[PDB]
């Protein structure tokens, strides 16, 4: 017949470096446009307030 | 003979590390309504335009 009585102490030092990257997107609004345009008059009379 | 005693080798549980990543946090951004003002008369006009001789 035996009887074992025990005790423990403990430390722990945990250092962590986390890198993360995320790319969100919406399928309805993927792109935005921009046009570079000029206006040409090949006619004979001038035209005003051109839209 | 001498008893093993068995104090165990495993320490704590993964469950704390599991809970760490288990973090959900806050997601999504404000959109749609914004402010909305708007005022001008490009919709309809009003000017005397009749016909005569």
From Swiss-Prot, chain A:
**Protein's cellular compartments:** Host cell membrane; Host endosome membrane
Q: How does it sit in the membrane?
A: Multi-pass membrane protein
Mutagenesis / variant outcome for changing residue 36 to D: In strain: PAI
Could you name the domain of life of the organism this protein comes from? Bacteria
The record comments on the domains as follows:
To pass through this hydrophobic restriction, substrate proteins LF and EF need to be unfolded prior to translocation.
Q: How does it assemble?
A: Homooligomer; homooligomerizes to form homoheptamers (PA-63(7)) or homooctamers (PA-63(8)). PA-63(7) or PA-63(8) form ring-shaped oligomers that are in a pre-pore conformation, which do not penetrate the host membrane. PA-63(8) displays an enhanced stability, suggesting that this form circulates in the blood to reach and exert toxicity even in distant tissues. Interacts with lethal factor (LF) and edema factor (EF); can bind LF and EF simultaneously and interaction takes place following homooligomerization on the host cell membrane.
Function statement? Mature form that oligomerizes and forms a pore to translocate the enzymatic toxin components edema factor (EF) and lethal factor (LF) into the host cytosol. Following attachment to host cell receptors and cleavage by FURIN, homooligomerizes to form ring-shaped oligomers that are in a pre-pore conformation, and associates with EF and LF. Toxin-leaded complexes are then endocytosed in a clathrin-dependent process, followed by a conformational change of oligomerized PA-63 from the pre-pore to pore state, which is triggered by the low pH in the endosome.
What name does this protein carry? Answer: Protective antigen PA-63
Curated annotation (Swiss-Prot), chain B:
Localization terms from the record: Secreted; Host cytoplasm, Host cytosol
Query: What is expression of this protein induced or repressed by?
Result: Positively transcriptionally regulated by AtxA, which, in turn, is induced by bicarbonate and high temperatures (37 degrees Celsius).
Top-rank lineage group of the source organism: Bacteria
Give the family per the record: Belongs to the peptidase M34 family.
Q: How does it assemble?
A: Interacts (via ATLF domain 1) with the cleaved form of protective antigen (PA-63) anthrax toxin; interaction is required for LF translocation into the host cytoplasm. Interacts with PA-63 homooligomers (either homoheptamers or homooctamers): three molecules of LF bind the PA-63 homoheptamer to form the PA(7)LF(3) complex, in which the relative position of the N-terminal alpha-helices in the three LFs determines which factor is translocated first.
Q: Can you quote the domain comment?
A: Lethal factor (LF) is composed of four domains: domain I contains the first ATLF domain that binds the membrane-translocating component protective antigen (PA); domains II, III and IV together create a long deep groove that holds the 16-residue N-terminal tail of MAPKK before cleavage. Domain IV contains the catalytic center.
Query: What does the UniProt record say this protein does?
Result: Lethal factor (LF), which constitutes one of the three proteins composing the anthrax toxin, is able to trigger rapid cell death in macrophages. Acts as a protease that cleaves the N-terminal of most dual specificity mitogen-activated protein kinase kinases (MAPKKs or MAP2Ks) (except for MAP2K5): cleavage invariably occurs within the N-terminal proline-rich region preceding the kinase domain, thus disrupting a sequence involved in directing specific protein-protein interactions necessary for the assembly of signaling complexes.
UniProt protein name: Lethal factor
Gene (UniProt): lef
* Shown chain mapped onto the complete sequence: 87 to 139 of 809
């Amino acid at each position: 017949n035996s009887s074992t009585v025990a005790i423990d102490h403990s430390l722990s030092l945990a250092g962590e470096r986390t890198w993360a990257e995320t790319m969100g997107l919406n399928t309805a609004d993927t792109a935005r446009l921009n046009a570079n345009i000029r206006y040409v008059n090949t006619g004979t009379a001038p035209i005003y307030n051109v839209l | 003979v001498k008893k093993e005693a068995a104090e165990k080798l495993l320490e704590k549980v993964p469950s704390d590390v599991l809970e760490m990543y288990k973090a959900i946090g806050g997601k999504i951004y404000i959109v749609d309504g914004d402010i909305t003002k708007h005022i001008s008369l490009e919709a309809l006009s009003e000017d005397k335009k009749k016909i005569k001789d």
